[PDB]
Symmetry: C2
Subunit: 57 residues, 2 copies
């Protein structure tokens, strides 16, 4: 399991989590600068199993 940061064809930065077999497990959304994208990833990984999951009803 590892994260992967790249630049798409349109011209924006994005991320995606790959499995052991290099299989895509989750896709992220676009960003302006590479800096902002990297900050988002660090926040996601600083997330614990105690982070609440809420649904809008």
């Amino acid at each position: 399991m590892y994260f992967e940061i790249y630049k798409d064809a349109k011209g924006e930065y994005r991320w995606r989590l790959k499995a052991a077999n290099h299989e895509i497990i989750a896709q992220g959304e676009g960003y302006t600068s590479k800096q902002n994208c990297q900050h988002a990833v660090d926040l996601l990984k600083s997330t614990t199993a105690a982070t609440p999951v809420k649904e809008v009803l």
Copy 2:
């Protein structure tokens, strides 16, 4: 900091990471089932700072 799962106009399910001042940090992707969306979130939160981050670039 918390995750939020909701539905758009296309009928797809998606998530987002909100912060204190109701500020969106990260955005999900379209999902065809509330079940699949919840599984993605659990996998994301099961990652730690030890999880490797590989970045490619021009």
